Design a protein around this ligand. Structure first.
Ligand SMILES: COc1ccc(S(=O)(=O)N2CCCCCC2)cc1NC(=O)Cc1c[nH]c2ccccc12
Ligand SMILES: COc1ccc(S(=O)(=O)N2CCCCCC2)cc1NC(=O)Cc1c[nH]c2ccccc12
Ligand SMILES: [Mg+2]
Ligand SMILES: [Mg+2]
Lengths: 448, 450, 458, 449
């Protein structure tokens, strides 16, 4: 319940708060959503401040005592020990300068407890600006989310789908095209398609990493690097790669592009949106397969968490949210001006949420839905034995001409191929029942 | 770390948690976003459960001691006293059944402390289903957000813009079309346009209320009202209207449409998306008019909150982007219902209620901390209007279009007013008095302000 | 071919072209999409220029021989006699000034063929600017599309759905929630829900018309009305309303808002987007209820419209629901383009008008045309599989609840279990377990298990 | 009119039309948009039908005489001689059945003129389904649009922006952050950023090609390849690669994924949407740069076509359309069921249009706007030299208070910072002219040479 001195008046700050005047001013300025930065974003801001202090100490610009204090305070933030010291709304100044200052002030307060005096700006923000810090922290968080969390969760889901594709390789059923009875497929073939969609999803995330991992650090206020060392960015990136193990982090190809635009986030969101499109198809098919029992398709049983398909519902709802977040990201991305895109906090919220939702729902879908599915094998065969058949596999036995006459008579009389063959008296020396039954076998027709 | 026994086994629940086994199972099944219901949707579930108990009591279906205990517990929820007792993810079963059961369990636990035993399902969920309750609460929350919070916030912003329009009635400046110099307007006219965009926004929200306020309560599992009293819906709506004063709440025109679809939320989101479009135009223009102080337009100065950065225009345009994205998520969920139930309700509810909250809060902040304190560079704006090639056209009938083009070119080159340029080129004569020049170049008259 | 001279130089123009040099420059400047204005937009530009000439004549600003020639030329354009004379890309200068000049030039060329010389700017564009004309024509076209075409098409679909709701009033079936078996409904109730969605869609279009019908005409370059008569807008609107019968057309409430923004198009697109969301639900349910007919739900049969497959000769597909869902997808995309253009005005003018007009008019057209085809070629001819639906309802575990008060919920659960195992009706299963006697007569069971009464049909 | 027949019976067809019964049913079933397939789509269908006939001939399944007649007619269709014989609406059955039958019927009618009888389904559709042919034609058209048309157009725009970046390397000006005056940049640096966005655009398009170029051909009705040779897909793709030179065309990794989903079109549309986002930033900045000539920024002059920024307006309208199309594509993409995604004609319309608009507008922007921009060089430098943003490097010599007084007086009097420092009498005590000129060198402050 203490008081502080801002160069435009007095500021009242909570007693257990490590933030100071500028942060409390942002709290008062932006009461919009009531939600602040996520743990991933706070962690990335701590990682960045420790790396910058390390490079400023290495170049002789910051006294080793001060640098050690920033590095220890930053490590605490990166390890999640201060997730309650970042109270600023997401809907803040569009550079994220408010959250940048919040990080500077918390490090200064942590350092003061350990007996060292740090200036938030002059020491913790040395060689940095209001504008190259928050987008760097955003891209660190997004790249960690892609590489450490999302890709492994998608691989878990891919592996679960692929395991079912192999278990069910010969579980024959009816194909459905336009929702109408089609020629046979196997449940395994369908699951091989779902698994490819997720494998292609991982390919799509991997393809965006060369641009998602681009960091602005070192470009300072406008991209020129004025008031930073010439190699600040390259040096800070190498410390971040060393401390995170994220080899995908890199300096920006062009320091102006990296601050004027957030195109890498727009690109990454498009991969997530494609994954959401794939997941929607997979989840919808699985809840339709599970439907009924009496009124639906009743092809598979879902694990109970008459079972409602609650994890397909959570997946399709997450996909809707990723599609909406993706529209917000593109809207912010397009609306930069000159040297700075000022939609960074909103874009950060949306892409980091999309990563988190897809990671968590993919691992739940894989573990608590896909792994436990059971096929209703005899029902699925009954459906395959009700699919349309074709005459092609009789060509070698009755010839192109009789086969075409079977096809025409089956269509006119609304009969099966098999029954039309029997009815036309074709069972004989050229075609036993056995030969008819082997040629028209529904698992053979699936070409598994 | 207290321990409970379920139909499937044993679950540990936090000691000070008022939720029970079903909520704890939902917490375990849906660790997806780490974000649960918002205050408005918890309040509405409290309002709904209180009105349902009142009606079940009035119809002689529920013992009055139990009904009174539910009503007192539901009032505490509606008053925001238990916002920490709703831990289930937004990304839950798509009917919102898990959150419905969370409400039933919390009410039973609150009642237990006052010495009254309630069964969550048989008593707190009496006459209700797993499918007509959550969407009712969603539409109560959205209707209240629209009528009680957003419309008044938009009226505050309208009135701030209109006050600026009146203050700046005679503040003449260059028009701009295609970003290029155009004939004169006043800042007041421009702000009159902004005010109309916000007044039309209020009309758009008002226009959606006949369908936003439709409640599914009484339709039970599929819309038929099986296992509810025949008049349960109209009775519960009447209690909600009597208690809340929200006369916009109404039974649904068609019980099936009210559960198979959430088209009222899609409709309302379109009104919020239009307001977000309007606010983007208003906020962009204001930050461009404040740009500078040297190399920008330097028309106005914004009040300093954090050379002032336009931080509230940035908040407004970021909120608008969020509303656009939320609007896309809502329409996606809305389209994808099947047969008797749309199972995207928790996601739709999160997005629609957030959109209401962000637009309400940012509209008030923009009105009070940006619009009200803008200051115009009045003399500078008039000098630029008076120096613009766009104003030479009214000279054509005195000096011809080719001499008027030469006046325009020299005025720009020498950074002079059109008036001073006409005098410097020796055009004052019998063909054009000083008085006729000042009439022809009266830029405030060119703006045609009331 | 035939030469001309623009203040920039000599321009070659096709011989049968009624456009002139400014239009030919715009053709050369914007080869982007290869698509120009639609018939509805051309018609509205013709309506507008005819009304402007009438007013300019009435106010003594334009000589009558000149006004009469513009009126006669503008009526030919509004009648669709010149839909090949508007070659400019949609993706043009964002005020639509290129298309406005195209209209002025085509009118001057028509008037020339009758011996009257019209200056495209000074006569055909009198009292107008490059910025209040194209948005006015856009709003006229959109209002016409809403009132004369879309609402009657939606009413036709509403009536077709409501006729099925009545015909199927007693067609009992199992509900589905989460795609899982639920308590009984009727096919008529479900179709009553679809009908309400369309009726609500008409209410949504009607609710947007007070602002969709607002016209910018009279505001000139920046909204101030400089260089027009003070009452030009109300006079032009009066003529348009009298000639067209479009009672929704009105002068804008605020002349700056009507040129700085196109918020009425964004608003109207939201209504269309909501209709696309409703149609998606209706069409999806209908193709699911038609699915199979051996491996799907087989609740209804859709009318056959064309062969489905060479490989599977008997197979017929739900082509109209596919056309409806694809249209809905296009409306939702168009809606995103409209809102993007709407947000990005600057100062006195929104310069996304041609792109917003393309998208809003296409959404109107696709929804009008598909709604009529869906009603006529799909809904009107649906047939229900009444006995299949009733069999499933009478076999459903969901219908045992009404037995609770006679045999208890535990015995009712055992009846459900056994019926679902032995593929029997609930009625038969109650008999097969000897529960008919003291507390439960055979007519009492038939009263409790009346599936149509459980649907609670009005 | 004449009488034609299909499995559903007899149909009246315009006497002279080359289509037959199924096309005419589709003309009556789908009068929705009044727009049919584009030139690119008709070309891809003609290419595919010729390639299928070559492979059927090579495998001895189709008589050489019939394969020759199909190949010749498919070449006339591909070359654009019969576009007026493709009347079917975009909004047709969602597999593109109707447009597949349109191609088969028109090939049969052309072959009949030359005295060869072809059955549209038994000969022209041999070893094929709609479900594999229409998505294959769509992916051929999209891959050709990406490689042959869009990437070269974007390279042209990249090169025009990079040429400006070089030409304007020393054209110092005010930076702008939040629309507010900031420390100096050069126009060249800004254009280098715009060039990077377009180069990255090209990288995004190239990164999607391993999946965009996947073709369904050979999977037939459901993905199983029933009723086709086991190697039909690999043979047909090899013929298409030889004929088109598009090495990016490839057999699908998984035949079921290639028919049950159109995820590669969704992926590709995301690249195009990101390009639209980049082009919006570039075009907005350029029209603001050109604003005025009195009351705006007046940094540059755009070439005339007082000039309105008409190609920036075309570029930002195109971008809005690509964002809309992108939403329609993702909506179709998500809504497949079981063995088939039935949104293909709508998804095809949208992505092919996005390719075309970006290609055409990128070339126009490059040639008729970027190439001809002129910079107000002296004006830009004067404002940079007059900005309060450049007073900071004086703080250590004159103190914060006097640096603030210098900035305030320079703004009020409309003078440079250098002239204001001299006017306030600060030379001698605090610093020398040599030190002043080092500290206020705006080109050096932009970290350019
Ligand atoms: C953001 O545009 C401006 C910002 C500041 C100033 S200022 O007042 O501070 N100052 C003018 C007085 C003398 C000192 C230099 C700058 C002017 C400008 N515009 C202009 O000069 C506009 C202009 C008029 N004739 C021109 C011819 C060529 C290019 C531009 C123009
Ligand atoms: C678009 O901004 C401009 C456009 C043109 C011109 S101009 O050169 O044609 N011209 C300059 C001489 C007299 C002023 C009017 C005419 C200047 C400007 N900006 C400014 O004066 C900037 C400015 C510096 N001190 C100020 C103090 C208050 C307000 C604005 C400013
Ligand atoms: Mg690595
Ligand atoms: Mg069945």
């Amino acid at each position: 319940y203490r008081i502080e001195h801002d160069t435009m008046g007095e500021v009242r700050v909570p007693a257990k708060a490590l933030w100071r005047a500028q942060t409390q001013r942002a709290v008062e300025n932006f009461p919009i959503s009531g939600r602040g930065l996520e743990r991933t974003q706070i962690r990335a801001l701590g990682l960045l401040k420790g790396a910058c202090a390390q490079v400023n100490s290495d170049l002789g610009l910051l006294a080793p005592e001060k640098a050690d204090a920033i590095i220890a305070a930053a490590a605490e933030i990166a390890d999640g020990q201060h997730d309650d010291q970042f109270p600023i709304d997401v809907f803040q100044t569009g550079s994220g300068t408010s959250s940048n200052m919040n990080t500077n002030e918390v490090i200064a307060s942590i350092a003061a407890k350990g007996g060292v005096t740090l200036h938030p700006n002059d020491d913790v923000n040395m060689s940095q600006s209001s504008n190259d810090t928050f987008p760097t922290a955003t891209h660190i968080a997004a790249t960690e989310a892609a590489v450490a969390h999302l890709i492994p969760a998608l691989q878990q889901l891919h592996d679960a789908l692929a395991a079912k594709a192999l278990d069910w390789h010969t579980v024959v059923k009816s194909g459905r095209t336009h929702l109408m009875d089609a020629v046979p497929v196997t449940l395994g073939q369908e699951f091989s398609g779902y698994a490819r969609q997720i494998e292609a999803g991982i390919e799509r995330v991997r393809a965006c990493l060369p641009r998602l991992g681009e960091l602005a650090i070192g470009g300072t206020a406008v991209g020129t690097g004025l008031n930073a060392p010439d190699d600040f960015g390259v040096r800070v990136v190498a410390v971040l790669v060393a401390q995170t193990g994220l080899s995908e982090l890199r300096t920006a190809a062009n320091s102006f592009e990296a601050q004027a635009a957030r195109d890498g986030l727009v690109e990454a969101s498009g991969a997530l949106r494609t994954i959401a499109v794939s997941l929607t198809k997979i989840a919808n098919d699985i809840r339709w397969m599970g439907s009924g029992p009496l009124t639906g398709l009743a092809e598979i049983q879902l694990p109970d968490l008459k079972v409602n398909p609650v994890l397909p519902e959570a997946v399709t709802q997450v996909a809707a949210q990723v599609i909406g977040n993706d529209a917000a990201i593109a809207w912010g991305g397009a609306n930069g001006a000159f040297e700075l895109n000022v939609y960074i906090p909103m874009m950060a919220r949306n892409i980091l949420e999309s990563f988190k939702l897809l990671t968590n729902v993919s691992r739940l879908f894989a573990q608590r839905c896909i792994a436990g599915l059971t096929a209703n094998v005899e029902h699925l065969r009954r459906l395959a034995e009700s699919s349309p058949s074709i005459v092609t596999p009789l060509n070698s036995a009755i010839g192109y001409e009789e086969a075409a006459a079977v096809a025409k008579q089956a269509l006119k009389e609304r009969k099966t191929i098999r029954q039309t063959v029997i009815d036309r008296g074709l069972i004989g020396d050229r075609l036993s029942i056995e030969d008819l039954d082997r040629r028209l076998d529904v698992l053979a027709m699936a070409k598994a």
